[PDB]
Write a protein that binds this ligand. Structure first.
Ligand SMILES: O=c1cnn([C@@H]2O[C@H](COP(=O)(O)O)[C@@H](O)[C@H]2O)c(=O)[nH]1
Ligand SMILES: O=c1cnn([C@@H]2O[C@H](COP(=O)(O)O)[C@@H](O)[C@H]2O)c(=O)[nH]1
Ligand SMILES: [Cl-]
Ligand SMILES: [Cl-]
Lengths: 212, 212
């Protein structure tokens, strides 16, 4: 939310992750935490970040299992304090609905990943992306993830989900995406390495914000 | 959190509540919602505020029932999207523990109210307040509520809970409490009428912030 910039905190060491996140906190109030950090330091890192930085946490768990397993993963994730969870849409509607049901029970949110940003996404995901986005609309999904690396696809996704849906977008910086162009369609950009591997993370974040 | 100022949104009409909260959002990112608004507009107002303003929501429900009923109230409140719930400590440890158990299950927080700010608090609550605070410490409570109207009591409460516990304090402005003096002991101040009944809520909030 703050500055339309979400930090992707993929460092795998608690000390380095806490250092960088603290250094850029004045520029970002929303942190995306994924498996590189959680599998290395434990799920308790989510509540620690939430408390220490007063930031919202999106768990990038790319949930992609059968309904029953998806339900268990979402429950454990929200118990850990996550505000939202990112879920793949490719496994189908029943799998997404399972996540939505738990989010409803726990007062949390689901973000539906429709198209990925890397080269390999063109093989199978891109061809199903429009239909995955329409499925999200039909299921009542209001939060989506789309690719910074393909603004024409981000535009098409925005067209399907409408202006009221919230859209966040990774692939900015390291993967080649541009902050400003991405924000023509997405509500917020996700940035990882361009900030956390920088010699001065705060200066990198400030620079991105200034560019937009 | 933002500016150490929490808005107590006790207007009873959705339109007025949304107007004032939006007007002061640049100064406050945390809103306390209680029964005056919830009983008038419904529990869905919590998720609406959270989404529309991107603010944290503390549900001031003064939970004060037997354990079994407290569990049900906390579950419904967190399902509605609240980030935290304020609970009375006077009904005893089992009643507080029930709230803590649900907060743990749902990845949320409990704030323990130890002493109230109004005149009547001197009759029964004040005499039990130190023991209620010690009970909170023994139960692992890390968030507390104490009175702006009695800074000497707020100091005593801070002494019992320690410097690492988070303490918020209502009674600022309308009830007579002072922002700066209260912040000598509390981490954040709660302000309702001084802001929401002001001719210019944003100017009132800005003034409080400037005074501290
Ligand atoms: O299609 C997607 C979905 N998610 N992410 C994630 O967003 C972050 C982007 O990081 P980066 O800025 O370092 O490339 C990483 O956590 C990555 O797993 C992508 O990069 N692409
Ligand atoms: O001891 C307490 C506990 N809670 N509150 C609550 O905090 C808010 C303070 O509002 P005010 O600034 O308008 O007096 C109101 O919602 C009120 O119920 C108090 O005032 N005193
Ligand atoms: Cl990814
Ligand atoms: Cl009260």
């Amino acid at each position: 939310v703050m500055n339309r910039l979400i930090l992707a905190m993929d460092l795998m060491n608690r000390d380095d992750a806490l250092r960088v996140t603290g250094e850029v906190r004045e520029y970002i109030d929303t942190v995306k935490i994924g498996y590189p950090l959680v599998l290395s330091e434990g799920m308790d890192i989510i509540a620690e970040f939430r408390k220490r930085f007063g930031c919202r946490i999106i768990a990038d768990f790319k949930v992609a299992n059968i309904p029953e397993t998806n339900e268990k993963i979402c429950r454990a994730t929200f118990k850990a304090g996550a505000d939202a969870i990112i879920v793949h849409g490719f496994p189908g509607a029943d799998s997404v609905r399972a996540c939505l049901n738990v989010a409803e029970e726990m007062g949390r949110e689901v973000f539906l990943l429709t198209e990925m940003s890397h080269p390999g996404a063109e093989m199978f995901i891109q061809g199903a992306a429009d239909e995955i986005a329409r499925m999200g609309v039909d299921l009542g999904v209001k939060n989506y993830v789309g690719p910074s690396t393909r603004p024409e696809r981000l535009s098409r996704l925005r067209e399907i989900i409408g202006q009221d849906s919230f859209l966040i977008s990774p692939g900015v910086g390291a993967q080649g995406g541009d902050p400003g162009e991405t924000l023509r369609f997405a509500d917020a950009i996700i940035v990882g390495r361009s900030i956390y591997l920088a010699d001065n993370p705060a200066a990198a974040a400030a620079g991105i914000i200034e560019s937009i």
